[PDB]
Design a protein around this nucleic acid. Sequence first.
DNA 1: TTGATGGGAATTTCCGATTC
DNA 2: GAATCGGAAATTCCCATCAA
Lengths: 274, 276
Amino acid sequence: PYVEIIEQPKQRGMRFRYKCEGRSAGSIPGERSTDTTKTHPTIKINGYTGPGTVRISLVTKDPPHRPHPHELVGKDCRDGYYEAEFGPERRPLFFQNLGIRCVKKKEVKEAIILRISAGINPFNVPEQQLLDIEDCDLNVVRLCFQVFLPDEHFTTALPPIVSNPIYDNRAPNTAELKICRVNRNSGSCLGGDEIFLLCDKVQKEDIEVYFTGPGWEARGSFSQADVHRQVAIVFRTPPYADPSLQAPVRVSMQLRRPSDRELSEPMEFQYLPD
Amino acid sequence: PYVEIIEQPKQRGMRFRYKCEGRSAGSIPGERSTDTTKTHPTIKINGYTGPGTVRISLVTKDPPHRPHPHELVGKDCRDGYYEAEFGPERRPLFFQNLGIRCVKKKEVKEAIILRISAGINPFNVPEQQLLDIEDCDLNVVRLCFQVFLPDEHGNFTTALPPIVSNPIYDNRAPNTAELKICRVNRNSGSCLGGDEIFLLCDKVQKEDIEVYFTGPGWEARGSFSQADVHRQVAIVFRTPPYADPSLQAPVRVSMQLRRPSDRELSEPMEFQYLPD
DNA sequence: TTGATGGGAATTTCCGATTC
DNA sequence: GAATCGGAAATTCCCATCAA
């Protein structure tokens, strides 16, 4: 048989906690989790019922999928990975109290060496590239689910599968984009209105303010000098498609990161006839 | 004789460099420095001419002037203090090479003990109190000048009374940083007040900041909540009502960031109240 | 060019408010 | 309570500038 991910983890939102912040790094959310009810990364073993073992490991975002320096902590976790005892019942396979613990940049080598020492290299990658020579990333991880089926004395290894990449909300370039507050949400259809936009930490060299409407797009209009300490952007509204507005049109304004073409939740802006 | 400070240090502006930032902590500027010419901490030895030695160490701000964990670095500095030289003439005694290196919060004890082991306790504070010192005193230091004058057979040991300078503040710690308004939404409003202002500024503490409007015999505060202080560098408030709600012509007042703790004030910005 | 300076941002660590 | 979380403080790091 094989393994399948039913509820992928959420990708943007949570901070990778360090070891010094102690305890557990909370618990990775389900992709569709909300305040009404919270979902958790959950899997099912297609075409099988019975006992077994599930082991979860952090792996790189990119194809070779090396084991990742960061490590999981929480329920049923030890030595930096998850390895729990599977029960026939299942409803299906929930993983709530998983938590991503990031390691200091200096402890990266000793961590990878610690991982492959325990024989965790799910995709048996050649050694010359696993020990690395380049970067790594450290802001993006992927869950790796390894399922072992009965034979113990749980050794029948199903194919290991990866989740969607998970992004550190604390890193400026992989963080979730968020408009916190604006001085005003309406302006002349001619544009040129100065807007003070308060947001979560961005990088001045990598941020734009993207206005859109049905078959229309326009950018902010500012310089890097206009990005105050990563959390305020002072820009001027762009001209709208129709400079002769007779009634207000509702457009959608949002922060956009060119690097990964990511977008904040839209904020309603209203072009006025002027 | 005795020693007196001719040019006090500047108090606010420079950040205490860490040991890891390497290099040198720049050079402590004189109080009266400008862009044309920079002044340096300078002293004179009242009523005396001859040889000697000057030793400078950092000590706490508060009445009992305990030795301070942080340390000086630069010309004629070693082991965390400044010592020796200036004997013959060159009578203005100035210290331009000075640099404040701060020590990590863990290694504070090791610093104090390393200092008093070198026998530096200018104001001979008891040992029972040196056992302390962990607090907000990591952000404020004082220069302590000890002057030793020649004595019997020619040895710089006499020791004049120690004098302290004005406190020097870490520009990097939020509670001791220099206040600065960087850019504002608009600088004119109804004399009735209630106009929303977006103020972009240097790192402040939401629990210890107000927006202080003043004019000839008049003061008024910002009006905002801590929830309105975005990520320590943005204040969204509403202007207060002016003294005269019946303005017939515009009146220009000065708006500025104010820190209640040490009543410090930013450079004022002009704001003109308008006839409603 | 070489090194010191200045000032912003990245990285780690802490801590009080909320919530479990 | 104990745990979680969002914000701030504490250290490092790196680059753009100015002195060497």
